[PDB]
Amino acid sequence: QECSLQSCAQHQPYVVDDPCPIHFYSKWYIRVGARKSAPLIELCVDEVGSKSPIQYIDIGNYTVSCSPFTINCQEPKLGSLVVRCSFYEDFLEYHDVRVVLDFI
Amino acid sequence: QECSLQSCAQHQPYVVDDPCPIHFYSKWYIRVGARKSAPLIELCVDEVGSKSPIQYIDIGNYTVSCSPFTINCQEPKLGSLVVRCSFYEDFLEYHDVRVVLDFI
Lengths: 104, 104
Ligand SMILES: [Ca+2]
Ligand SMILES: [Ca+2]
Ligand SMILES: [Ca+2]
Ligand SMILES: [Ca+2]
Prior knowledge:
Two copies of one chain form a homodimer.
Chain A: E1 3-8, E2 13-15, E3 25-32, E4 40-42, E5 63-66, E6 69-72, E7 79-86, E8 94-103
One calcium ion binds next to loops of chain A.
PDB class: viral protein
Keywords: nonstructural protein, accessory protein, viral protein
Assembly: dimeric
């Protein structure tokens, strides 16, 4: 039920305002199709050497940097941009915030 | 509040939760292309008159009813869904809330 609306210059890099509290841990995902039954694809944990039959790639450099989290300012197409927030490093209790973009 | 996140079953009718305070006046818009520099197109205008210069009518199935405002649960392609909330009937002091959908 929590939503973060942010404005950025379309087609240019955008350092996202992380909506989690500043001392909370944050993990970034795409919820495929913005559907709750669909997978949460974790964004900034890419280890090479996957042999999975399903692999996610970044043709257009949607994710520009992981530190700090920076995206190309563009309409989400695979699904919704979602950050998961926790006081605990192990994410024992967490809340998810969707990040929505208005274009300047 | 700038962002309202709501859940509905995709392609089924959905009565949109008005995120404005219950005693506030509210008008529904599409913001073309989700761009701040684009026009707001007012939805569900009853009749052209002193309060509404132009009646906009969708040619497809996005709007199910205008009383109460009911959509076919989907994200709009023309732009973002925005509600303008005002304590006053003249809409001189107001705030806009963007409505976005998670799909069941
Ligand atoms: Ca922040
Ligand atoms: Ca943070
Ligand atoms: Ca309400
Ligand atoms: Ca209302």
